[PDB]
Every structure is written in C-alpha cells, then in structure tokens.
C-alpha cells in the first residue's frame, strides 16, 4: 500500500 502511514 502507498500513501498511508502506520502507528503502533
């Protein structure tokens, strides 16, 4: 996927 972040 592109154009999307990731938070943990």
């Amino acid at each position: 996927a592109v154009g999307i972040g990731a938070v943990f």
Partner: antibody, heavy 126, light 113 residues
Framework: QVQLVESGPGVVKPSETLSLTCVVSGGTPGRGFLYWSWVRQPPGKGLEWIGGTATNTDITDYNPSLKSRAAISKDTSRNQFLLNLKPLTAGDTAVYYC?????????????????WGPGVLVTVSS | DIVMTQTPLSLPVTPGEPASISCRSSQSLLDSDGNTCLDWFLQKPGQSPQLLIYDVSNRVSGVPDRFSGSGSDTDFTLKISRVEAEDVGVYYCMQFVEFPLTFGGGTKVEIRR
C-alpha cells in the same frame, strides 16, 4: 490527527501562486508515521489526489497529471504542511482538502486514522 | 495511472430499499502483503469526504452494519441493505496500491420521494 485546518487566499490570479497551509492538531501519542495528502474537488466534480508526503521524511510524491506545477512541503515543528501551485489555469478553481491517513495498530484490532480538513474554495480568475 | 470506474453516477433510492454501487480498477489492487487496497468514502452534503469502508470490507467505527463491501482484485461493490436519509451524499472509491492515488468518479445517493 484530531483536527486539520486549511487556510489560504480565496481568489488567486492566473499568473500568481496558489499557497495553502494545513495546520495539524495531533492526538493521542503513538509510534510510526502519518501520510499527509492534498486532494482537490472542482465545483460539481470528483476528487483528484494532488500529492503528499510521509511525516518522517522530506520526499514528496506527486500526481503526474499536475505537470510538476505543485510543490508540497511539511514542518512537524510548525505542525504544518503546505501546497504551492504555479502557474495557474481557470481549471484549478476547486475546493482544496488536506488529509491525514495511517493504519492504526495501537488497539486490540487493526483500525484506521483518516482525517480531512474542512477544505478551502480557491477561485483562479483575472 | 490506475483507472477507477464507478457506477452509477446518480442513485435515487426509496427509503428502506437496497442500493448497490459498483467500482472497477484497470489493474489488480492486491499488494505484496495480500491486502486489497480499496477504500470507500462518503461525502455528506456540505461536508468533507470521510472514510466509510477500508480494505474492501472493513467498516469504520460508527458505520452501521447496513453498509457492506465486497470485491475481487479488480471489481468491488458497496451495498446498502436499507437506505436511510442519513445515507445521502456522494460515495467515492479510491485505490492506494500505487501512486498516483486515484478515485472513482463518485455516486450521488439521494432520497426517492
């Protein structure tokens, strides 16, 4: 990611520069990064992705349809990110939105962060 | 660019009846990790779009179970089992398997009276 606020001139002439600012009010802490995008909507038409950037980097992705007229930047210290457009055509009159997206793994289930500003109408006309 | 085609452009629905919105991509939206990168947004009148369904079939919190999403790699369907007044607005599909991000043309759902 709690709130996005757009600002900028409401009318710009075709030779001038369209400059927009998006101010990000963040939310609960987390590790990782967000992706911030500009999206525009001409009156009565659909959505077009202009470009964007991840918050951790200084590299911007651009829509080729925009003929390298767009310049997008960010400053997490100024909690802002910016759009500059030049030269302009009447075809660039539109509502401009800033957006923030991320996959959210902080909860027990996978979820999404997806926030849009209210948008600002920009009319290009002589 | 990946081309997204959405049908129909305008959908009048009598309250209580089902509605179906179709979307296609010109390429598979399946990415390396096996996820199908297709999201659905709803833009209510006089408001910004917001996320409704993500990764083909996952409902955002607060979205009623009346909304369901299905699809293959290239053909996707948003179904509303019984349409209510709060559902009116423009629905957009969007792919994010590759840059540039591209949207379907939108489907305007309105109340049939």
């Amino acid at each position: 990611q709690v709130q996005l606020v757009e600002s900028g001139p409401g009318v710009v002439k075709p030779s001038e520069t369209l400059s927009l600012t998006c101010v990000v009010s963040g939310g609960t802490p987390g590790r990782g990064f967000l992706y911030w995008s500009w999206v525009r909507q001409p009156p009565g038409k659909g959505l077009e992705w202009i470009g964007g950037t991840a918050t951790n980097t200084d590299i911007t992705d651009y829509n080729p349809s925009l003929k390298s007229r767009a310049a997008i930047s960010k400053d997490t210290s100024r909690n802002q990110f910016l759009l500059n457009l030049k030269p302009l055509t009447a075809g660039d009159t539109a509502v401009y939105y800033c957006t923030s997206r991320a996959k959210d793994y902080r909860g027990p289930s996978y979820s999404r962060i997806d926030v849009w500003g209210p948008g600002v109408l920009v009319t290009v006309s002589s | 660019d990946i081309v997204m085609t959405q049908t129909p452009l305008s959908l009048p629905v009598t309250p209580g009846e089902p509605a179906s919105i179709s979307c296609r991509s010109s390429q598979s939206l399946l990415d390396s990790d096996g996820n199908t990168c297709l999201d659905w947004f709803l833009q209510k009148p006089g408001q910004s779009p917001q996320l409704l369904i993500y990764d083909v079939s996952n409902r955002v919190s607060g979205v009623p179970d009346r909304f369901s999403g299905s699809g293959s790699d290239t053909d996707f369907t948003l179904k509303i089992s019984r349409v209510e007044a709060e559902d009116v607005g423009v629905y957009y599909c969007m792919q994010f398997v590759e840059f540039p991000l591209t949207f379907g043309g939108g489907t305007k759902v309105e109340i049939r009276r």
